[PDB]
């Protein structure tokens, strides 16, 4: 399973360009896709989302109309067409995949990344800590607080926990506050009360060192946490 | 809406799945289903080669018409439990070997092979599931009968028989006898054809037969009846 | 003379209306409510029942017009005329479309099994509906209510300039309303006989009987109206003129209306009620 | 073969004939005891209110 | 002497029969004569699952009692969600002739099979996102009538070759083979203990086999015709058998005898499927006369009728939490009842 995304480079301001994301090793048709970009020094932020069969093509509020995204199912590719770049658009674009059914793990796999440089009522996510000293082998609790109740009458609360090793793509940790991502050690766990949710690390390791992000998946404009960084 | 983003996306996945299911159902409906029964060594394999585990499945298209032929010769189980799964087939191909009336069943000489053939035919033609389903009944080993009749008169298998030893009279006798096993004449039909290894129009006979069945089915559906 | 016949055809109107409403409602209930719209012919039959009922609103208002002066109003008068005319064109195109469908089913099955789907049937029936509405609109705008001899009459009002249009629109129901589609009806239904004659079925005799019954009955209650309308148009444009002939033509218009819209009752029975499937469904419903 | 088949069948019934069997009253008592132990828990036997029933 | 062997078999049969006669002083009906009846019970069509185009032959409920799996001759094994009638999965089958479907207790795997004589084990949860044939288990010389997962590695398959089998999935071989059942085995049911299981066959009898030792301990007779469905009492020492003679026969494992029969003069068709509730008070049986029947277990009275399927009811199931009863009939609709 790979998500190779190509393009990037330095572009004159106001330019237009297409970012590419070539996928292999899985049924690209059955998996919806997302483009999620990261500023050089800030956290991740949602950009675009396209469902399976191209039924829905959603974009974040700040970037609607200016951005477009399409998919080539016969060739298993994803393209993000880009118009009139600004200094705010200088970022690191990540290609993310998702699937939606009961028991599925959205945002499970993330891409390697592409760099793009440009010359000169939404749910609020708060990670109040933003810096915590860590000592290996000791349990750390990192709490993310949302503006509105992430619980839904269906019985689900929609919070996602992502770990970013340095110089590495984000990795899913917990979905729906309590479901451990497949392939992730049990040292991480989650627990929340519908307004604030904590990720608990039992025994810290070197792999645990990184930056953690919290997502909500209730309203379509996805909002990200600031990022809690681990310093040993 | 009162549905989350993930709930809506799951509903969209379900919509895609229903669309694919409808497409596959249309594709299956375009297809013509034949259930092939051969009483022992009744030319089943030979005709199978000509037109080209428990069940043997074959698919072939002739003049833009698709055919799925299901052979159940190797089942060797209680037919009452798995013969109803074939309710709804376009037609039943039934192979009878004419050369078998001199030969006897492997389970002692007590029953003739033709006798077993007609009990099996009486079972399947009159089965409750195949009430309205047509039968294309193939008379195989025509050359063997033609060469071999003069040695043994047909009266041994049919004591009531009184006729010449020529091919035509004997074949007419057997065809009439097999068509006589049909308890219920009005609903269904029986198509008889004699085949050898040389002929290449046996599958054409199958096509005309299933075309008749298709026309009858639509006549029932279209209101002409 | 015409008054006694008018009372007789009013009693016939009452019986005709109740029977047609009951038959169309029962066919609709069986096809969509009690059972499923499985086949393309099932869709076609249900839509033909809707077309029939769309025609059967008309006769209560027409009966009231015949018995008494119009009191509904000009807009209601146009609505009544529209109901009548959409029933008309819908009958044309639906009978012809089912004719084509049966031709495909019986003659070219190797193509029918693939062309005949729910989507194709929906597209054809839809196109029939829009064509009927677009044909109705020009006669929708024509109808007007006028007071003659103290009696209010809702009728298709034509001026001297519109008199030529009256000839064209009356002929349009002949040359385009019936002549073009009944060429297809003729070609398909006799062709069903030739293929069915060259066939081996136990059901071929019953099917021959039913197809002959349909093809004769459609003519019986469908051609006299068109030929009488054509003759009336000829009289209006004065090639064949006679005052006593004109009175006989008015009487013939009344009786040919009777003949034409007895179809709203007879067509459902011959197109749905006869046949094994509908009797089976009726028996199942009675069992329920 | 056939004689050996009969022999094996005979040893089969011989093995099956040695099973201890308890009084049928004890059997019915056990059945009714399990029936009474979980009578309240079963949703079909005792109708549930619509609030906690998910299939609404 | 072969006649001597037959005589010994007859003597053993007499010994078994009179052992049962001595071990049965009374019957069930007199014992439960004082208890209050269930009374009239009705279950509505809460959900109707669509999308199947051929006759439904088998159903199975997931462990959580949210997901379910449905099999039909259209070659589609469809995994559905109950409350939201969504198709979480739809698997095209190689062999459209399917009569058995199974949901693994861990929910990771699903089993299918039929006239193909092969049991297909399907891995739902994979990185690729597509359900794949995890393993193809072969070896039965007849059609696979039913198959239940012992766990993610061990599976039991009953077949029409007059045999049951216990297969190890990862190796792909059949570790154990249960033989001695004259007819074609039509159904099997694992106990909650998951080591002993009862299987009924076409020879009008059932046998309780053990998974570990691999030999039948108790053989139960009583029916006049074939046995189509078998199920275990929720506790474990009793089991119910649905047969072609319009009677449901409930037996106890310890008493080794027929504890009760269920029949009424109206029903004449066979019983396609049988099931039990959570408490064991209710026995649900689908028949060929198009309607499921709910019987009281302690009193042979019929508790009610679940009607609403326009064709033969071919499979039944009860949710593990016991909340819902799913009936899948040949009319290509599965209905959930509550």
């Amino acid at each position: 399973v790979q998500l190779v995304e190509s393009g990037g480079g330095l572009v004159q301001p106001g330019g237009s360009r297409k970012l590419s994301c070539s996928a292999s090793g899985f049924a690209f048709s059955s998996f919806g896709m997302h483009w999620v970009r990261q500023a050089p020094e800030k956290g991740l932020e949602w950009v675009a989302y396209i469902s399976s069969g191209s039924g829905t093509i959603y974009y974040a509020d700040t970037v609607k109309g200016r951005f477009t995204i399409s998919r080539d199912d016969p060739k298993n590719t994803l393209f993000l067409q880009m118009t009139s770049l600004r200094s705010e658009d200088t970022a690191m674009y990540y290609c993310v995949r998702s699937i939606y059914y009961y028991g599925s793990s959205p945002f499970d796999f993330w891409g390697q990344g592409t760099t793009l440089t440009v010359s000169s009522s939404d749910i609020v996510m708060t990670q109040a800590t933003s810096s915590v000293p860590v000592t290996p082998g000791e349990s750390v609790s990192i709490s993310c607080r949302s503006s509105k109740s992430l619980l839904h009458s269906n019985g689900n609360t929609y919070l996602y926990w992502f770990l970013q090793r340095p110089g590495q793509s984000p990795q899913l940790l917990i979905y729906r506050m309590s479901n451990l991502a497949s392939g992730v050690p049990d040292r991480f766990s989650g627990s929340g009360s519908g307004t604030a949710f904590t990720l608990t690390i039992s025994r810290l390791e070197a792999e645990d060192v990184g930056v953690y992000y919290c997502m909500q998946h209730l309203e379509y404009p996805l909002t990200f946490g600031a990022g809690t960084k681990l310093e040993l | 809406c009162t549905l989350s983003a993930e709930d809506k996306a799951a509903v969209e996945r379900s919509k895609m799945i229903d669309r694919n299911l409808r497409e596959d159902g249309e594709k299956a409906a375009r297809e013509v289903k034949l259930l092939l029964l051969g009483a022992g060594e009744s030319g089943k394999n030979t005709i199978v080669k000509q037109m080209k585990t428990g069940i043997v499945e074959t698919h072939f298209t002739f003049k833009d018409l698709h055919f799925k032929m299901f052979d159940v010769g190797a089942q060797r189980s209680e037919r009452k439990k798995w013969i109803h799964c074939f309710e709804g087939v376009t037609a039943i191909i039934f192979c009878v070997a004419l050369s078998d009336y001199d030969l006897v069943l492997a389970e002692d000489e007590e029953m003739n092979r033709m006798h077993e053939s007609m009990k099996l035919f009486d079972s399947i033609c009159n089965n409750k599931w195949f009430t309205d389903t047509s039968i294309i009944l193939f008379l195989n080993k025509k050359d063997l009968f033609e060469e071999k009749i003069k040695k043994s008169p047909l009266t041994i298998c049919y004591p009531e028989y009184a006729g010449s030893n020529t091919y035509e009279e004997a074949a007419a006798y057997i065809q009439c006898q097999f068509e006589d096993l049909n308890k219920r004449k009005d609903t269904k039909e029986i198509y008889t054809h004699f085949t050898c290894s040389t002929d290449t129009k046996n599958v054409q006979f199958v096509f005309d037969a299933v075309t008749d069945v298709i026309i009858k089915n639509n006549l029932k559906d279209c209101g002409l009846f | 003379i015409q008054t006694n016949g008018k009372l007789l055809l009013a009693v016939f109107y009452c019986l005709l209306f109740v029977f047609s409403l009951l038959g169309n409602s029962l066919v609709i209930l069986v096809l969509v409510v009690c059972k499923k719209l499985r086949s393309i012919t099932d869709v076609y039959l249900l839509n033909l029942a809707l077309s029939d009922l769309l025609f059967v609103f008309s006769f209560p208002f027409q009966t009231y017009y015949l018995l008494d002066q119009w009191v509904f109003g000009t807009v209601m008068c146009k609505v009544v005329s529209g109901f009548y005319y959409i029933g008309f064109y819908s009958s044309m195109f639906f009978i012809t479309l089912m004719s084509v469908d049966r031709y495909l089913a019986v003659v070219h099955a190797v193509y029918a099994l693939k062309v005949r789907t729910i989507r194709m049937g929906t597209t054809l029936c839809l196109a029939v509906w829009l064509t009927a509405i677009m044909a109705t609109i020009p006669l929708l705008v024509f109808y007007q209510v006028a007071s003659e001899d103290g009696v209010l009459q809702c009728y298709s009002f034509y001026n001297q300039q519109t008199l030529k249009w009256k000839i064209f629109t009356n002929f349009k129901m002949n040359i385009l309303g019936l002549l073009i589609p009944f060429t297809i009806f003729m070609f398909c239904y006799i062709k069903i006989l030739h293929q069915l004659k060259r066939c081996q079925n136990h059901n071929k005799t019953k099917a021959i009987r039913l197809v002959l019954i349909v093809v004769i009955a459609s003519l019986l209650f469908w051609v006299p109206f068109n030929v009488v309308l054509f003759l009336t148009s000829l009289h209006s444009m004065h090639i064949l003129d006679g005052c006593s002939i004109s009175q006989q033509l008015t009487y013939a218009t009344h009786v040919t209306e009777i003949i034409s819209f007895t179809h709203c009752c007879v067509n459902p029975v011959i197109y749905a009620f006869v046949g094994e499937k509908f009797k089976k469904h009726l028996s199942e419903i009675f069992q329920k | 073969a056939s004689i050996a088949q009969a022999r094996k069948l005979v040893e089969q019934l011989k093995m099956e004939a040695n099973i201890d069997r308890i009084k049928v009253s004890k059997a019915a008592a056990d059945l009714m005891a399990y029936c009474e132990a979980h009578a309240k828990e079963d949703p079909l036997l005792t109708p549930v209110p619509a609030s906690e029933n998910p299939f609404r | 002497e072969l006649d001597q062997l037959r005589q010994e078999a007859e003597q053993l049969k007499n010994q078994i029969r009179d052992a049962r006669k001595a071990c049965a002083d009374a019957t069930l009906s007199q014992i439960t004569n004082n208890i209050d009846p269930v009374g009239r019970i009705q279950m509505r069509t809460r959900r109707t699952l669509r999308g199947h185009l051929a006759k439904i032959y088998a159903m199975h409920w997931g462990t959580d009692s949210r997901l379910l799996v449905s099999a039909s001759q259209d070659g589609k094994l469809i995994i559905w969600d109950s409350y939201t009638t969504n198709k979480v999965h739809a698997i095209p089958l190689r062999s459209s002739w399917v009569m058995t479907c199974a949901y693994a207790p861990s929910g990771n795997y699903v089993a299918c099979g039929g006239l193909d004589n092969i049991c297909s084990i399907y891995n739902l949860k994979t990185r690729e996102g597509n359900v794949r044939v995890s393993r193809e288990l072969a070896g039965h010389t007849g059609y696979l009538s039913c198959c239940r997962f012992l766990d993610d590695n061990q599976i039991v398959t009953s077949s029409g070759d007059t045999t049951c089998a216990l297969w190890d999935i990862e190796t792909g071989q059949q570790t154990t083979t249960f033989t001695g059942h004259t007819g074609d085995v039509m159904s099997l049911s694992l106990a909650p203990d998951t080591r002993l299981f009862v299987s009924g066959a076409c020879d009008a009898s059932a046998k309780l086999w053990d998974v570990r030792e691999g030999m039948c301990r108790q053989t139960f007779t009583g029916h006049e015709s074939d046995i189509n469905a078998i199920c275990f009492f929720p506790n474990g020492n009793a089991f119910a058998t649905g047969s072609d003679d319009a009677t449901c026969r409930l037996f106890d494992l310890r008493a080794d005898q027929e504890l009760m029969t269920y029949s009424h003069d109206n029903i004449i068709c066979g019983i396609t499927s049988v099931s039990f509730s959570k408490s064991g008070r209710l026995l649900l049986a689908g028949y060929d006369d198009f309607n499921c029947n709910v019987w009281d277990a302690l009193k042979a009275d019929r508790a009610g009728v679940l009607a609403g399927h326009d064709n033969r009811v071919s499979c039944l199931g009860v949710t593990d939490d016991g909340m819902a009863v799913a009936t899948g009939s040949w009319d290509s609709f599965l209905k959930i009842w509550n």
Side-chain angles (χ1 to χ4, degrees), chain A, chain B residues 1-220 222-225, chain C, chain D, chain E:
Chain A
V1 174
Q2 295 169 356
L3 283 181
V4 195
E5 35 188 337
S6 176
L10 178 61
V11 184
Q12 306 175 1
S16 301
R17 218 253 290 287
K18 168 169 287 179
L19 263 306
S20 309
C21 173
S22 180
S24 55
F26 50 96
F28 179 97
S29 34
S30 67
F31 283 97
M33 299 284 318
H34 304 243
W35 275 99
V36 166
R37 96 196 171 221
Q38 186 178 29
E41 299 174 0
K42 295 294 296 299
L44 330 180
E45 175 211 34
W46 181 58
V47 185
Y49 157 62
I50 176 173
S51 73
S52 313
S54 319
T56 77
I57 328 182
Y58 290 139
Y59 311 87
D61 314 328
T62 88
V63 278
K64 202 176 302 299
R66 220 185 31 219
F67 276 118
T68 42
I69 173 186
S70 58
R71 72 194 316 165
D72 196 3
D73 263 16
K75 297 186 183 180
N76 311 6
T77 45
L78 186 70
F79 296 120
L80 175 78
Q81 179 51 40
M82 263 201 326
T83 65
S84 71
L85 294 177
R86 35 201 62 52
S87 306
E88 315 170 0
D89 289 347
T90 299
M92 151 56 58
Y93 279 74
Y94 281 121
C95 202
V96 183
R97 64 191 211 101
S98 61
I99 204 165
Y100 302 78
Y101 53 81
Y102 175 36
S104 61
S105 169
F107 294 81
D108 210 21
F109 195 74
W110 284 59
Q112 294 305 313
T114 326
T115 311
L116 187 122
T117 319
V118 187
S119 178
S120 59
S121 64
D122 68 307
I123 275 165
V124 175
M125 201 75 48
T126 314
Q127 263 184 10
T129 47
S130 176
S131 51
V132 282
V134 297
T135 59
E138 162 255 295
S139 306
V140 303
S141 170
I142 286 156
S143 185
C144 182
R145 178 181 52 93
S146 159
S147 42
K148 92 157 307 313
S149 184
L150 288 199
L151 167 92
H152 189 159
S153 57
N154 51 39
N156 280 327
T157 170
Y158 299 77
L159 188 90
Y160 293 71
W161 273 107
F162 297 94
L163 171 153
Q164 180 136 42
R165 226 170 328 288
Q168 236 294 355
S169 62
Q171 177 167 341
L172 180 55
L173 287 201
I174 291 282
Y175 54 105
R176 292 189 279 266
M177 159 201 39
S178 38
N179 293 277
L180 191 43
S182 38
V184 152
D186 314 49
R187 324 191 281 241
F188 319 96
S189 87
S191 63
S193 193
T195 190
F197 325 101
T198 89
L199 194 167
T200 82
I201 309 206
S202 78
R203 299 154 280 102
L204 269 154
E205 312 287 329
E207 175 255 325
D208 305 359
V209 185
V211 199
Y212 298 161
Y213 302 127
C214 38
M215 282 200 48
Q216 57 99 2
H217 213 285
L218 257 181
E219 67 160 6
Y220 255 119
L222 306 172
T223 41
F224 254 112
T228 294
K229 187 187 178 180
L230 296 204
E231 302 93 1
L232 75 147
Chain B
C1 190
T2 73
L3 270 207
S4 82
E6 316 190 2
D7 296 321
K8 262 184 312 268
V11 170
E12 295 184 23
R13 171 173 171 96
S14 179
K15 284 324 172 215
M16 262 94 68
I17 292 203
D18 313 354
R19 195 187 314 174
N20 272 11
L21 262 52
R22 288 195 311 271
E23 220 197 35
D24 285 335
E26 273 129 25
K27 294 202 51 43
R30 277 185 278 272
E31 257 199 332
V32 162
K33 326 170 48 62
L34 291 167
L35 161 73
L36 157 65
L37 321 188
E41 187 236 359
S42 281
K44 206 238 84 176
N45 289 337
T46 311
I47 65 153
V48 156
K49 325 142 43 170
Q50 296 162 351
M51 334 201 193
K52 273 227 283 203
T53 192
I55 211 155
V56 202
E57 217 178 308
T58 309
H59 332 310
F60 60 92
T61 323
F62 207 175
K63 60 197 87 56
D64 306 347
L65 192 63
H66 324 288
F67 297 102
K68 292 189 292 185
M69 180 186 318
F70 325 120
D71 179 17
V72 290
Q75 199 66 212
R76 304 171 183 180
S77 59
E78 302 255 4
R79 199 164 58 244
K80 48 182 307 293
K81 315 301 290 185
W82 54 268
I83 208 59
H84 59 122
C85 302
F86 300 116
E87 174 182 0
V89 284
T90 326
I92 309 159
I93 294 188
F94 204 97
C95 292
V96 179
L98 295 174
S99 65
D100 284 357
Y101 84 100
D102 207 357
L103 315 162
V104 283
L105 259 203
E107 296 87 18
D108 290 357
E109 300 186 0
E110 298 165 354
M111 51 310 297
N112 225 27
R113 219 162 299 182
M114 281 302 284
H115 290 328
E116 171 220 8
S117 324
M118 315 155 256
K119 350 201 194 65
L120 159 47
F121 182 39
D122 222 6
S123 179
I124 299 263
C125 205
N126 317 337
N127 236 315
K128 61 148 74 85
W129 312 109
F130 308 145
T131 313
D132 53 88
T133 279
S134 70
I135 278 168
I136 319 170
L137 175 168
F138 270 150
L139 271 309
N140 321 340
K141 316 343 171 288
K142 81 161 166 92
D143 198 18
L144 213 56
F145 197 141
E146 179 170 356
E147 169 261 21
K148 163 269 172 161
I149 169 67
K150 315 207 146 208
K151 320 170 180 180
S152 34
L154 196 66
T155 322
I156 185 182
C157 192
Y158 296 51
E160 30 174 2
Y161 172 56
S164 68
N165 272 6
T166 64
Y167 180 121
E168 320 155 316
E169 159 82 19
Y173 187 15
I174 330 181
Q175 173 180 350
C176 289
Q177 282 292 148
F178 269 100
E179 291 158 343
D180 282 354
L181 311 192
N182 187 207
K183 300 342 217 157
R184 75 154 64 49
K185 260 292 141 65
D186 49 349
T187 70
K188 55 166 59 200
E189 259 187 50
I190 296 143
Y191 318 89
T192 295
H193 167 246
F194 303 79
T195 179
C196 55
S197 64
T198 57
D199 46 40
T200 60
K201 72 105 206 172
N202 322 328
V203 315
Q204 178 65 60
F205 187 82
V206 192
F207 184 109
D208 297 67
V210 278
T211 278
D212 222 325
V213 202
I214 289 180
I215 302 207
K216 184 185 193 301
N217 300 331
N218 289 337
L219 249 69
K220 255 167 302 177
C222 288
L224 295 187
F225 184 49
Chain C
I1 331 179
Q2 191 203 270
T3 325
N4 189 26
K6 187 173 301 300
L7 181 62
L8 292 175
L9 66 88
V11 182
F12 298 151
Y13 274 173
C14 290
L15 297 171
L16 207 152
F17 177 61
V18 278
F19 293 153
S20 207
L21 184 69
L22 276 207
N24 302 337
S25 295
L26 168 69
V27 181
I28 291 166
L29 261 280
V30 171
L31 275 177
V32 65
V33 185
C34 302
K35 297 297 177 306
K36 290 179 297 180
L37 224 50
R38 291 116 184 178
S39 98
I40 314 79
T41 89
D42 291 357
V43 165
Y44 269 171
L45 253 175
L46 179 88
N47 280 46
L48 173 90
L50 327 164
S51 100
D52 290 357
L53 152 62
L54 262 51
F55 200 34
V56 315
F57 330 117
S58 148
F59 327 109
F61 331 129
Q62 293 264 10
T63 317
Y64 183 76
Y65 172 103
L66 293 179
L67 297 178
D68 203 23
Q69 58 168 1
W70 198 261
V71 302
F72 291 102
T74 317
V75 46
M76 345 305 283
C77 157
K78 288 183 176 303
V79 172
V80 173
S81 79
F83 279 145
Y84 189 99
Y85 280 133
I86 88 166
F88 173 100
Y89 313 116
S90 54
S91 293
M92 313 325 143
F93 299 115
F94 267 151
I95 189 55
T96 304
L97 213 55
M98 296 209 57
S99 167
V100 187
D101 194 36
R102 289 176 169 179
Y103 170 86
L104 285 174
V106 192
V107 181
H108 312 278
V110 202
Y111 202 47
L113 88 172
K114 67 191 315 143
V115 296
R116 284 169 80 231
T117 51
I118 298 285
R119 313 166 181 178
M120 199 52 251
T122 50
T123 316
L124 278 177
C125 80
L126 241 193
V128 159
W129 282 118
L130 309 84
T131 279
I133 298 178
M134 302 172 49
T136 311
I137 296 171
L139 280 143
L140 266 168
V141 298
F142 282 151
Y143 265 66
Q144 286 184 9
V145 176
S147 186
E148 309 177 3
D149 298 351
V151 171
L152 293 154
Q153 303 180 13
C154 154
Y155 61 97
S156 49
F157 177 76
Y158 303 105
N159 205 19
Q160 182 62 42
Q161 318 165 1
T162 299
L163 189 62
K164 178 212 61 180
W165 293 109
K166 164 192 177 182
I167 291 311
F168 154 74
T169 191
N170 296 338
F171 262 116
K172 162 237 314 171
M173 338 171 198
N174 187 44
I175 63 175
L176 207 168
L178 200 141
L179 274 182
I180 295 187
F182 263 60
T183 306
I184 292 207
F185 189 102
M186 271 315 98
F187 169 69
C188 295
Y189 267 107
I190 330 169
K191 265 294 296 299
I192 289 166
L193 290 160
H194 270 165
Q195 183 103 356
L196 210 74
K197 224 35 184 174
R198 196 196 40 89
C199 157
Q200 313 167 350
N201 266 134
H202 301 285
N203 295 357
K204 68 161 287 305
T205 66
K206 163 69 75 62
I208 278 174
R209 153 187 320 140
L210 292 196
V211 65
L212 283 172
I213 274 188
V214 175
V215 68
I216 301 172
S218 312
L219 291 176
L220 260 286
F221 42 71
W222 259 72
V223 75
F225 155 72
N226 77 51
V227 278
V228 161
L229 181 53
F230 141 68
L231 293 164
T232 314
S233 304
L234 284 206
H235 210 287
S236 305
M237 59 151 215
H238 300 303
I239 303 303
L240 313 171
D241 259 359
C243 182
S244 85
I245 305 182
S246 81
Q247 308 147 11
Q248 295 157 16
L249 264 187
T250 313
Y251 283 49
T253 299
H254 293 303
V255 309
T256 203
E257 278 174 349
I258 281 314
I259 273 186
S260 51
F261 53 53
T262 200
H263 95 287
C264 76
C265 324
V266 47
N267 217 12
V269 85
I270 325 285
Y271 253 81
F273 284 149
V274 73
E276 185 191 5
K277 64 213 152 298
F278 220 90
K279 315 156 42 66
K280 191 181 306 176
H281 299 97
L282 283 174
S283 178
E284 292 170 22
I285 290 164
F286 177 71
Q287 180 186 3
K288 295 169 187 183
Chain D
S2 65
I3 35 176
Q5 214 265 8
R7 290 177 52 183
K8 305 176 306 212
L9 152 74
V10 161
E11 338 309 340
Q12 192 43 30
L13 295 174
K14 204 178 305 296
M15 211 318 293
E16 291 202 16
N18 315 128
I19 40 168
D20 57 308
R21 305 141 198 256
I22 316 100
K23 185 34 62 183
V24 77
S25 173
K26 182 65 181 306
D30 283 34
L31 268 291
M32 193 164 8
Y34 194 84
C35 261
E36 193 46 69
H38 309 82
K40 299 93 50 187
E41 319 172 11
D42 181 54
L44 279 295
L45 170 71
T46 313
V48 285
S51 298
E52 75 200 0
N53 162 41
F55 308 89
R56 270 191 293 184
Chain E
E1 188 197 19
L2 181 58
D3 190 29
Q4 204 278 336
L5 271 296
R6 299 287 297 271
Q7 179 195 14
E8 176 66 49
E10 185 62 42
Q11 300 157 342
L12 287 149
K13 279 166 52 183
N14 299 346
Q15 175 195 356
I16 293 174
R17 184 170 24 66
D18 52 40
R20 323 258 188 99
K21 186 180 181 179
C23 289
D25 56 357
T27 182
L28 175 62
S29 48
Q30 294 143 6
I31 276 188
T32 68
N33 266 344
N34 53 21
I35 72 166
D36 297 9
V38 180
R40 189 59 169 95
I41 163 166
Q42 285 107 335
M43 289 84 104
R44 341 178 173 226
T45 306
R46 324 320 320 270
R47 305 258 179 286
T48 304
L49 302 157
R50 339 284 296 284
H52 266 323
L53 302 178
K55 282 167 300 205
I56 315 177
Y57 263 134
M59 87 84 53
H60 205 201
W61 270 108
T63 298
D64 60 350
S65 100
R66 180 140 182 231
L67 294 178
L68 88 158
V69 172
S70 302
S72 57
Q73 304 291 88
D74 50 10
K76 272 85 179 59
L77 206 82
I78 316 190
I79 304 179
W80 284 317
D81 173 16
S82 58
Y83 330 93
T84 89
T85 57
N86 316 348
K87 319 197 167 47
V88 51
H89 271 303
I91 321 164
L93 305 171
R94 180 158 298 123
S95 87
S96 57
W97 320 108
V98 51
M99 327 170 167
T100 167
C101 76
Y103 218 148
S106 158
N108 298 3
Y109 284 91
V110 162
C112 95
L115 301 183
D116 63 333
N117 292 16
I118 317 304
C119 194
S120 297
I121 292 326
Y122 276 110
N123 187 6
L124 310 186
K125 294 146 190 55
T126 36
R127 285 249 171 209
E128 292 79 15
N130 39 77
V131 189
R132 294 193 310 304
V133 178
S134 182
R135 184 71 82 258
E136 274 203 7
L137 299 180
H140 283 284
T141 36
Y143 62 96
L144 314 188
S145 44
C146 154
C147 45
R148 294 331 210 201
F149 279 99
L150 270 184
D151 75 27
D152 284 351
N153 174 27
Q154 339 190 314
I155 187 185
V156 189
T157 62
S158 90
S159 174
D161 78 313
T162 73
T163 76
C164 286
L166 161 78
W167 310 76
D168 165 292
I169 293 199
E170 44 159 356
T171 72
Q173 346 295 341
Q174 26 169 5
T175 311
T176 313
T177 297
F178 313 116
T179 46
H181 213 176
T182 320
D184 305 1
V185 195
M186 255 334 295
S187 180
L188 72 104
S189 170
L190 295 173
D193 163 78
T194 48
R195 258 69 144 278
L196 292 50
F197 82 96
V198 287
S199 62
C202 192
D203 57 352
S205 61
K207 284 173 181 292
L208 164 74
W209 317 80
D210 61 59
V211 174
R212 297 279 84 253
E213 286 285 336
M215 52 178 210
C216 172
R217 304 181 181 310
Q218 310 165 324
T219 302
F220 298 80
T221 45
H223 272 316
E224 270 47 29
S225 157
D226 321 324
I227 283 171
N228 327 85
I230 202 163
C231 188
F232 254 113
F233 197 77
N235 155 287
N237 34 76
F239 71 104
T241 280
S243 177
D244 256 350
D245 60 354
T247 72
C248 289
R249 222 164 286 255
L250 184 179
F251 310 80
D252 156 34
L253 282 193
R254 300 115 69 92
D256 207 24
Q257 28 200 10
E258 49 154 3
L259 181 143
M260 162 95 78
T261 71
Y262 302 116
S263 147
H264 186 8
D265 298 350
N266 294 357
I267 321 90
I268 323 288
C269 61
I271 308 161
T272 319
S273 149
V274 75
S275 171
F276 258 124
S277 68
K278 191 177 188 60
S279 53
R281 274 301 310 250
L282 298 200
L283 190 148
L284 303 111
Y287 298 78
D288 309 315
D289 38 33
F290 303 0
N291 51 329
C292 178
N293 295 347
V294 202
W295 304 82
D296 189 12
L298 317 183
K299 299 167 166 292
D301 82 78
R302 84 211 311 270
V305 159
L306 303 195
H309 286 271
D310 300 23
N311 198 278
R312 148 176 312 194
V313 164
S314 168
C315 56
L316 249 170
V318 169
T319 36
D320 263 8
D321 46 32
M323 278 222 97
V325 174
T327 279
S329 58
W330 275 6
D331 67 342
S332 299
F333 303 111
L334 272 93
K335 286 176 167 62
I336 308 165
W337 309 66
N338 233 323

